[PDB]
């Protein structure tokens, strides 16, 4: 098992995946976990889609929550895999949080800001703007990359990271949704 959180690259109390070297803060895993698991635990990237080996102690699994409208159980797992894959990629750091409100030009130019913290929240059924289809998830990810390409100079580090991470994402999308075209 690795020494730093797969998502935020910091230390502290870290939950180890039983199947890959990745370790996570409870709140950095997607979905965030409400407690430390007592027994076998496998992360979202390793968990089998068909036969789920364990349900998670997360917000969407609470009794009052799983009746609410939202993604199907199948689409929830697929979209969580897509979003956690984004968050664990080294290139993703500039997209974890919204751009600082001090960035005068950024917010003059980008009219529909998007970042991975918003996407994480909308995967939760209790969010007022919760996703109901995988198309909405894919649309927000693609909006995030479009904003990056719109604002940043093409030769900049962040512009390059955005373009390269988007290529990785579209590859994962075809892996996870081989039969669904999001055109």
């Amino acid at each position: 098992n690795e020494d730093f959180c797969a998502v935020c690259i910091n230390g502290g109390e870290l939950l180890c995946c039983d199947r890959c070297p990745k370790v996570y803060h409870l709140s950095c895993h997607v979905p965030a976990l409400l407690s430390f698991p007592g027994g076998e635990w496998v992360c979202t990237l390793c968990r089998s889609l068909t036969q789920p080996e364990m349900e998670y102690d997360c917000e969407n699994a609470r009794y009052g929550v799983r009746v609410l409208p939202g993604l199907s159980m199948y689409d929830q797992k697929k979209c969580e895999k897509l979003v956690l894959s984004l968050c664990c990629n080294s290139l993703s750091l500039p997209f974890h949080e919204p751009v600082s409100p001090l960035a005068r030009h950024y917010y003059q130019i980008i009219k529909r800001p998007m970042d991975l913290s918003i996407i994480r929240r909308k995967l939760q059924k209790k969010d007022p703007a919760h996703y109901t289809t995988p198309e909405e998830v894919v649309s927000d990810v693609r909006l995030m990359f479009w904003n990056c390409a719109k604002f940043n100079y093409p030769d900049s580090e962040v512009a390059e990271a955005g373009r390269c991470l988007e290529v990785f994402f579209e590859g994962w999308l075809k892996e996870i949704y081989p039969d669904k075209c999001f055109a």
Partner: peptide, 10 residues
């Protein structure tokens, strides 16, 4: 359920 502790560090 293994956990570890690591020293914490546009």
């Amino acid at each position: 359920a293994r956990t570890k502790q690591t020293a914490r560090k546009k």
